[PDB]
Structure 1
Amino acid sequence: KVFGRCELAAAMKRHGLDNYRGYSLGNWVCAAKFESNFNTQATNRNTDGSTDYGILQINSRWWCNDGRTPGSRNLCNIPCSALLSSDITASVNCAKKIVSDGNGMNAWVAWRNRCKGTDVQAWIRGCRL
């Protein structure tokens, strides 16, 4: 599913991501924009052989099981395929664990490089929320 911008903002809020660990909704929408362009089915293969999955490009080295990432963990206790669903519940619940891991949203390098320090409120501007 490719979400609309405000549609995704609403879904993220519904699932308790708004201001989670102090990160406003615009931060999460911005991260999703640059990680996946709002496409739940996004996948990308990393140089280390791990893969990133879903709207927030969650990585199989630590967070989910895909059966093809040697030496990896599955800290969210989910198959990576769950992160590709039209229902963002699994991605949100896993993102909550990731952002609580110590480095906040810096875990998403694209958030650090493209969202951090910017006017992230623009991502939810106009949205009925």
Structure 2
Amino acid sequence: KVFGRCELAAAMKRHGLDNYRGYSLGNWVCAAKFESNFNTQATNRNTDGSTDYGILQINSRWWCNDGRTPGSRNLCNIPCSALLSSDITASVNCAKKIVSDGNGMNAWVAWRNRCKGTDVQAWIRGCRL
């Protein structure tokens, strides 16, 4: 599913991400934009052999099981394919664990390089939330 910007903002708000660990909604929308282009089916292979899955590009090195990432963890206790659903519940719940790990949203390289320090409120401008 390719979400609209405001549609995804509404879903992320409903699932409790607005100001989760102090990150406003705009941070999450900005992150999804530059990770996945708001596409739940997005997958990308990392150099280390792991893969990133879904709207927030969650990595099989640590968070999910995709059956092909040796010596990795599954800290969200889910198959990576759950992260490609039209329903973002699994992505959001796993994201909450990630952002709680100690590094906050720096875990998402696209967030650190493209969203951090910017006017992220722009990502939810116009949206009925």
Q: With structure 2 as the length reference, what TM-score do the two structures score?
A: 1.00
TM-superposition CA deviations, 1:46-103 (whole Å, max 9, x none): 0000000000000000000001000000000000000000000000000000000000
C-alpha RMSD of the superposition: 0.2
Partner-residue secondary structure (3-state), 1:44: strand
Once the two structures are superposed, residues 3-41 of structure 1 have per-residue CA deviations (whole angstroms, 9 ceiling, x without a partner) of 000000000000001100000000000000000000000
**How many angstroms apart in 2 are the aligned matches of 1:10 and 1:118?**
21
Q: Which runs of 5+ in 1 are unaligned?
A: none
CA shift for structure 1 position 119:
0.3
Give unpaired runs (5+ residues) of structure 2: none
% identical equivalent positions: 100
Q: Match of 2:81?
A: 81
SS in 2 for 1:123: helix
Could you list the structure 1 runs, at least 4 aligned residues long, displaced by more than 3 angstroms after superposition.
none
Q: How many residues align?
A: 129
CA distance in 1, matches of 2:128, 2:91: 22
Distance 1:12 1:46 in 2: 26
| Cα shift readout 1:89-125 (whole Å, capped 9, x = no counterpart) | 0000000000000000000010000000000000000
The equivalent of 2:109 in structure 1 is: 109
Within 2, Cα distance between the matches of 1:121 and 1:73?
A: 34
Distance 2:128 2:19 in 1: 17
C-alpha distance in 2 between matches for 1:67 and 1:5: 32
